[PDB]
């Protein structure tokens, strides 16, 4: 499955 | 063997027409199992591989629901880069993110990456202690301080040693048969006269998974590398690669060269000559 | 920024034989950006029903795709896969020979 994680730029 | 699982994430603007564009693909070694498409009907990540589409609902609708906010977050990415480097709003940018984990003939974790790209060059990535950065830029400086600031390498980490390496293997025991199996190479070979003193001498390797493959050439046993046409290992459209290999050959003197062939599913190198 | 030419591949699934159905690949790939437009074509024409695989990439960030279409060889029918990019002055065109 997919990350639940994703930081902004 | 050993085996990863990789997601991929491609984002594209497109000034004045509408929203960004947004992919999503999921591979499981050589495989490719669910795939998300901000330009699609259905709004939802989509089985791509008959081993996925028993997941049920809940899978679905959780893997739809994250991907989508990945989406939006990419989306914000765009407006921020463009600010970073001053660019104009009209200008059409691409985002590239890749992250995903490999494990060993044990199944066992050996390595975590996440690699972000702007425009098709590095941008930042996770060094592999996966507790460190790689800032190229001194707008990916910036990024990775806010990074460092929120801890994101340490949710990372937790993911990529975890659960990342969880459903890998939950997915190779449900799709053990497609996943786990080996397709050695069906090879042969071609000969074709170029002209009157010269020929085509072109070595096949056929419906064999995974992708990974050495196939070479040699003339009296040494290694031809820069006198050999080699194409780049393609997919056959049926979950199988090919790949060949071609020398020409001084008419009369076909038989000095050899073919060598090695993959995982080969229980010895092949050797061919042409006789 | 960045511009890297598609490299094209004309090929069919399984080895041509005049008569059996098959299926004609084009691959495309080390490309950037990810615009790209690739057509398949019999004698010279566009073929309508193609069908291509989901945008993805490689280590060095360059996209690959795979365009298909289900077709029957034949001794006397031409096909061809004609690709544009922006790293390309015109449509690059490569023909499908079947020992390649």
């Known amino acids: 499955i997919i990350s639940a994680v994703v930081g902004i730029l | 063997g050993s085996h990863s699982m990789r997601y991929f994430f491609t984002s594209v603007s497109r000034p004045g027409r509408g929203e960004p564009r947004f992919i999503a693909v999921g591979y499981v070694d050589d495989t490719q199992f669910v795939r998300f498409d901000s330009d699609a009907a259905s709004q939802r990540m989509e089985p791509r591989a008959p081993w996925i589409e028993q997941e049920g ?3 679905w609708d959780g893997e739809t629901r994250k991907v989508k906010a990945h989406s939006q977050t990419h989306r914000v990415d765009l407006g921020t880069l ?4 001053n660019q104009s709003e009209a200008g059409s940018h691409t985002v590239q993110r890749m992250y995903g984990c490999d494990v060993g003939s044990d199944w066992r974790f050996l390595r975590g990456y996440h690699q972000y790209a702007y425009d098709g060059k590095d941008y930042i990535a996770l060094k592999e202690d996966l507790r460190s950065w790689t800032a190229a830029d001194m707008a990916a400086q910036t990024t990775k301080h806010k990074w460092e ?6 949710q990372l980490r937790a993911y990529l040693e975890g659960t990342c390496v969880e459903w890998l293997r939950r997915y190779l025991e449900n799709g053990k048969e497609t996943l786990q199996r080996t397709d050695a190479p069906k090879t042969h070979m071609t000969h074709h006269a170029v ?5 085509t001498l072109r070595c096949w390797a056929l419906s064999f998974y995974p992708a990974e493959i050495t196939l070479t050439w040699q003339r009296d046993g040494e290694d031809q590398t820069q006198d050999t046409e080699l194409v780049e290992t393609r997919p056959a459209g049926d979950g199988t690669f090919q790949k060949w290999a071609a020398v020409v050959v001084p008419s009369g ?3 000095r060269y050899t073919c060598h062939v090695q993959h995982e599913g080969l229980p010895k190198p092949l050797t061919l000559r042409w006789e | 920024m960045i511009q890297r030419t598609p490299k094209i591949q004309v090929y069919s699934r399984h080895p041509a034989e005049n008569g059996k159905s098959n299926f004609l690949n084009c691959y495309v790939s080390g490309f950037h950006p990810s615009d790209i437009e690739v057509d398949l074509l019999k004698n010279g024409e566009r073929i309508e029903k193609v069908e291509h695989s989901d ?5 060095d960030w360059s996209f690959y795709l795979l365009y298909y279409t289900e077709f029957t060889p034949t001794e006397k029918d031409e096909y061809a896969c004609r690709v544009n990019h922006v790293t390309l002055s015109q449509p ?3 023909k499908w020979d079947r020992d390649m």
Do not use: C, M, N, T
């Open chain 3, 55 to 59: 945008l993805s990439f490689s280590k």
């Open chain 2, 253 to 255: 003197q076909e038989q």
């Open chain 2, 195 to 199: 002209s009157d003193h010269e020929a």
């Open chain 2, 82 to 85: 463009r600010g970073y480097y």
């Open chain 2, 149 to 154: 600031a929120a801890h994101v390498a340490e």
């Open chain 3, 92 to 94: 690059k065109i490569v």
């Open chain 2, 57 to 59: 609902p809940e899978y």
